[PDB]
Design a protein around this nucleic acid. Sequence first.
RNA 1: UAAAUUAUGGUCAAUUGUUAGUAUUCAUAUUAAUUUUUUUAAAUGUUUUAUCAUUUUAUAAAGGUUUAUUUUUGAAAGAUUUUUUGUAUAAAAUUUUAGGAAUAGUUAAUAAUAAUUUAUAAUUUUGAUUAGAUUGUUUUGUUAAUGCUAUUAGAUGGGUGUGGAAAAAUAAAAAAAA
Lengths: 213, 110, 256, 55, 190, 51, 214
Amino acid sequence: GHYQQEAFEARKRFEESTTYPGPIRAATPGDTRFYSGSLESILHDTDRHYWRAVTDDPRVQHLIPLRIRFKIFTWVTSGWEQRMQVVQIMAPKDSTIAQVKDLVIVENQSPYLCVSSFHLAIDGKELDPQKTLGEYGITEQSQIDAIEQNDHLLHRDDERPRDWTVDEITAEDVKRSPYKEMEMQPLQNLAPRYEARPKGYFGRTYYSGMKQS
Amino acid sequence: RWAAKFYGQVTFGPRNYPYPSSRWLARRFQMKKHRIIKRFRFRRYKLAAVANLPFAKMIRVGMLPELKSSKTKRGDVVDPTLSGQLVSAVKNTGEKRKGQRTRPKSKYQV
Amino acid sequence: ERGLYFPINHRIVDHRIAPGVTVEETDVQSRYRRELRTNFATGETRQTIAPPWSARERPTHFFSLRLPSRNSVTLRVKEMHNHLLFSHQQCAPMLVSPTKLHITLGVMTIPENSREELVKNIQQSMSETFACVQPLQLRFRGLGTFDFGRVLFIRVVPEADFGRLERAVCDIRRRVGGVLGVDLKGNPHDSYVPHVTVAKIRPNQRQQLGDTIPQSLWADYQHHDFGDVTLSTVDLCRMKGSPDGYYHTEGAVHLS
Amino acid sequence: IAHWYCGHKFRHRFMRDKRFHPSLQASHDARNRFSKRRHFKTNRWNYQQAYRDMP
Amino acid sequence: PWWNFQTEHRQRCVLMYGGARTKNTHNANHRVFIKKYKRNAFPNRTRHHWAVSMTGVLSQRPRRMPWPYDLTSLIFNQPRQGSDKIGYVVGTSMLKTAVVATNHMVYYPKFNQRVSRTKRFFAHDEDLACVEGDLVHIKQCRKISKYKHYYVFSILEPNVEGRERLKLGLKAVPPPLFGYPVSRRIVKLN
Amino acid sequence: FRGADTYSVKYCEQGRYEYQRYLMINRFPSEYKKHFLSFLSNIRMSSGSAT
Amino acid sequence: FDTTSPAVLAVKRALKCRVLRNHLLTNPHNNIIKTVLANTERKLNHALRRLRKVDFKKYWEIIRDHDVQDILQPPNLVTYRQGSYWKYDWNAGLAISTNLADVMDPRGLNGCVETGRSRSEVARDLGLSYTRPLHENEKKQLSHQAVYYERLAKFKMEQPEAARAMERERFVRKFSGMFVKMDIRSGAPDFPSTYRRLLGTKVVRWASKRHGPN
RNA sequence: UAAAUUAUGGUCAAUUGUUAGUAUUCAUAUUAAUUUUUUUAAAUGUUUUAUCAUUUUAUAAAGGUUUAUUUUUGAAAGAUUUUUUGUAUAAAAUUUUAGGAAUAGUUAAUAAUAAUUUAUAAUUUUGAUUAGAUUGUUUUGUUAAUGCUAUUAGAUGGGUGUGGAAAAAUAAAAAAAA
Ligand SMILES: [Mg+2]
Ligand SMILES: [Mg+2]
Ligand SMILES: [Mg+2]
Ligand SMILES: [Mg+2]
Ligand SMILES: [Mg+2]
Ligand SMILES: [Mg+2]
Ligand SMILES: [Mg+2]
Ligand SMILES: [Mg+2]
Ligand SMILES: [Mg+2]
């Protein structure tokens, strides 16, 4: 918005200064890992956990915290839900989109995400695995999605996983994949016990951007 | 020393009484001490304190089944190895070996 | 079951993500302790940073403490090379030859026109600054990184005569950059971090070598002790690698 | 002095109060105030060669 | 009304004019100790309970109360009590962890005098400067691990002897000759 | 007697707020940031149309 | 004419001590001199511990000449753990006596009052490293830890199935187990400590209420 | 190392046993209590709603805890036409038994690792852990008084985890959307 161009322009004018001595690092503190409160809070790199009244010199950001979005199928008791999971890397400024794929693959801790090949895309347009973040104007604020192989098949009943509510789960597939891990047959402590949202939660029509009634 | 010098408070006289004990009181307590000691001798008491064991808790060897004086009372339960070793100690304490230092002997020590 | 239910190291809030996002819309997942991993662990070091205009131009000459012959340092660095090359021989182009080992006290850009005025004037000011300073016994242990893990060096511990160095340097810093305006890559009111550069990745090299020296090489030598050295000799050097087989030396001062 | 605390005599109360007295407290000099005698002569026969890494 | 005699009482529901509205808790109850165990067998190794045990904390005679005024508050202005502590480093066996012994103060109002007690803390030194026997400044902070709420703020006095001792490859300090006391007699010869 | 005649006269000779002494209250750096922020966003607006 | 100064005192007491020692070696029981040897040894201990805070190299060479390191050894673990061994040079008044500037450049020994950052932080910022010489323990621990991410990157690049297995177990674990969400009860850093009242009856995991300092 | 006055100021400390040679807080006293008396409590059916459902209605059962109990606003208050922020879970002090010994899903680093990661780990004689007794840091009684002597009650793990917060299975005396 306004911030982005205000600070961009500020940086760009700062770089064209003929006369500047350079900052004194005794006057330019780092950040503290030690502050009150139990939680450990990660902030912007321009920001500190103490009060600093003075505005520090604009720096180019050498580690850009990209966010890459995935679609997961979350099991809730009623049936499957399709929701969103972000993976966040720190990708070096000049890095190549291939390398961004690689960093993204290493950083995900969920078993259900990276199984097949995925393509990075912005507003539905694929990115060249060949070229730099610089060219595509990728910043933290930029919205990056990720698209799997079978994702364009999800409108069918096949690729989309089958919920034991409406579908047979057989000794074929009891031993394979999220079904196996889930332990469909109830145990005393109830197995891994997944989040549940009921059937009448959204009414007769499911969740939408547009009000349908 | 291990044992008790006195039994009960042997110096009880009024303050500034210019001796540790009076004759009267010391005679009373000498009586009580006498009775206790005589009891120790005739019942043939034996105590032991073993290394690498709690010391304040002393195995009473005079109650051990082998060395027990009474024919009736149930004596005590002490480890078989340890009790053998205690029996051997008590036994080989008795007599003077030459070159060893002379140590006081009595009837009631056996 | 073998520890805290929620391990304390895992409790992390990201404030660089908008409020309300993590509660409803989506959850954000990241390995957050790569970033939180500190300046001691990574081995980074914060050097005096250049203003952009100075950052544009290559440095030409530098101040150096010359290491004498028969050093503890040179010997142990040779031992370290042996070990590193036996582990991974991909290091071979990164490593600096033991012949070029020197302590870097500061870096500077001299333009080629004013060259002689500047070298004479510098040399003189340098000789005046170091007039009173007797030789310096400094201690070297530990490794560190400049320029995002591209430069791998031996730290100079502030346990010894180092204190004196700091005043000494900060004087030439206030003469060479303060008095006659010269481009010291930093502020003259700021002190430079002295170091012995061991491995380095130049721009041309970077393609075949990679963008950062993998920490797996020097991890074990990170805190290794290279020993003590007494130093009588200060040089102002231009960087030419073929003139004498040692950095081409434009000026010299003896500490005695 | 309430008679239920500590022993049936009075002086037992003041004998446990000496355990809390300010100027009587345990430190680097006065140690093991409560059982001195269980720890007495404990190391006599324990032979420990003292620690010297310097000549 | 607590200032009125036993016989002077009329209404028990209110204070007529002013003063303190006081509930009488009955202090003299003749409470007693029940003896449930033989003097021979008491079911504890270290201590035995034969009488009525005094209870509470600060209700405990003779009263021992927190004393804010000591060396530490003398030097520091603390936002919260115990936010600053000065102490000595005792041992470093744990990476990035310095154990610190510190003194604080207790006041006995009965005898009108103070005692110093001592307490150990785990402090977090990133970068591992602290050598055993350093005099350090220590602050309260973010919860770091199960037991570490404190970090090393500044080294007041480093240990120069200890550091040079380390540089030579020797331990910072000689290991204590005897450990904790025992109730046994260890006969170990040659 | 708790009445007005029990206290001295000098309580009514006093100017206002003169019983106060300078209070140095420090607090953690973190807490300064929190507090300054709070006061800032309160000065902007405390309540929605109610300000 | 110096007598009372620490170095002198330490030396003369060192000598007296050796003499008395070899004397006791010859004729076994005179307990008068056992006692005088012990007192001398104590006053020697005082003299040496004052020396190392006055000038430490002389302290060193005295210990190396006369071989007394045995009276500098802290007596027992108990009083040492409470830091009353280090507490001596507080009482002697030598605790602040160092005069740093010749050693240990003071710039990175102090923390920032307004910033709140520790001394390791301002040392980080000035690009200085104070670190004690490390033994092989700390070196091999650190050098083992430094490399975690390279090992991990190699693992999840080259061997995705094994990884996905482990992840299955973790992810599913998060739903099983004792507490699924973090609340004051769950997020209690010391569980057995803050709830001691559960320890015998309800909660059987822990047999004691205290595993650490507090 | 000198006195002082423009004179009682800045608002009350005040102790009561008839014993039995003498030494030592110890029977019979007053005050406060239990002995001792039905002038302050109380009965069951909570309530709306769109109908087999969904909205409102969050700390008195017991167990015995002494290094111990700690927290937000997203509910309501609450006011605008819609995206609204940041601050919290952490600690420090005070902790009992006449005669006193070892404790343990265990410390610290790594990390959303490890039922076999790495390490010379952690608690204890400055009194631990088990075990007894016990409801913790404005409440009483006596007294001229540093003391001695009381103070209830209320937070007892998890297992489809709802909810802003578990405080959620009789036991009000809290008006609960005309
Ligand atoms: Mg006789
Ligand atoms: Mg003879
Ligand atoms: Mg805790
Ligand atoms: Mg229990
Ligand atoms: Mg209850
Ligand atoms: Mg208990
Ligand atoms: Mg506490
Ligand atoms: Mg706490
Ligand atoms: Mg249950």
